[PDB]
């Protein structure tokens, strides 16, 4: 029932290989729905989910304009930040930005976000109160005083409490059949021996949406967190995700081990054993 909209900006300079690239993508929960790449033939906000296609020309024109303005502003900002750190003109650098809103099941704002990084290091973030900034160093303090002068925090609060929540509610309705449908994982347990005395038990989860899931192994009903290999959750390419947890067990002791699965699409949480 809880939901989020996030936009992600990446601005990467490439000295000697043209002007910095600006890329903007939008997600609702784990579903991408829009993209903008300043390297494209015709740079425009483009759809990436069917339920956004129905928006009208004003929408696509406005979002493209914001993104084309952002392209030039992020180029100015990469040069500024290069100055703030006394960096030469030869290296490549990256600004990343993430902002958006979380809403609860009723659709009321839980909290807003706006955070920036430079070359992968935290740089400046809007505080949870949507009205003050946390700067990471004396360079980001310059950005902070520019943003205080620009009433950036105030404009973002208005957006995060207004347009962000309102459009998210609109998107969750227009795409309810997918955005509001949780697909349970298909599960099974496998057994690969490693030696005469030990075997690998692997618990599999496939075809689930959204990506949030809990997979755990237990031994005599007690968690094996230290000993579980948890692969990172991975996209299948069809909107769904995949994951597995693996534990190495003594031969013969397999039945003291249960795999536990929690996912929003599941009627009940699952308990699984190896079934030879």
């Amino acid at each position: 029932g809880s939901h989020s909209m996030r936009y992600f900006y990446t601005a990467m300079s490439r000295p000697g290989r043209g002007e910095p690239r600006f890329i903007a993508v939008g997600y609702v929960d784990d579903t991408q729905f829009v993209r903008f790449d300043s390297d494209a033939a015709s740079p425009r906000m483009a759809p990436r989910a069917p339920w956004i296609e129905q928006e009208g020309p004003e929408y696509w024109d406005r979002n493209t304009q914001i993104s084309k303005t952002n392209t030039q502003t992020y180029r100015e900002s990469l040069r500024n930040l290069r100055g703030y750190y006394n960096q030469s003109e030869a290296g490549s650098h990256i600004i990343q930005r993430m902002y958006g809103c979380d809403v609860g099941p009723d659709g009321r704002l839980l909290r807003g976000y706006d955070q920036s990084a430079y070359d992968g290091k935290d740089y400046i973030a809007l505080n949870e109160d949507l009205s003050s900034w946390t700067a990471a160093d004396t360079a980001a303090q310059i950005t902070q005083r520019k943003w205080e002068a620009a009433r950036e925090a105030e404009q973002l609060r208005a957006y995060l409490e207004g347009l962000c929540v309102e459009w998210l509610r609109r998107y969750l309705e227009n795409g309810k059949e997918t955005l509001q449908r949780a697909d349970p994982p298909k599960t099974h347990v496998t057994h690969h021996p490693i030696s005469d005395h030990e075997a690998t038990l692997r618990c599999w989860a496939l075809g689930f949406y959204p990506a949030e899931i809990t997979l755990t192994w237990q031994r005599d009903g007690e968690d094996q967190t230290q000993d579980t290999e948890l692969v990172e959750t991975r996209p299948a390419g069809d909107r769904t995700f995949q994951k597995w947890a693996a534990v190495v067990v003594p031969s013969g002791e397999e039945q003291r081990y249960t795999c536990h699965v929690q996912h929003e699409g599941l009627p009940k949480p699952l308990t699984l054993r190896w079934e030879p």
């Binding site: 903007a24 939008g26 100015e76 930040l81 520019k146 950036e152 404009q155 347009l163 962000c164």
Partner: peptide, 9 residues
């Protein structure tokens, strides 16, 4: 919908 273009860093 995107937020409006913010100020340069």
């Amino acid at each position: 919908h995107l937020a409006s273009s913010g100020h340069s860093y």
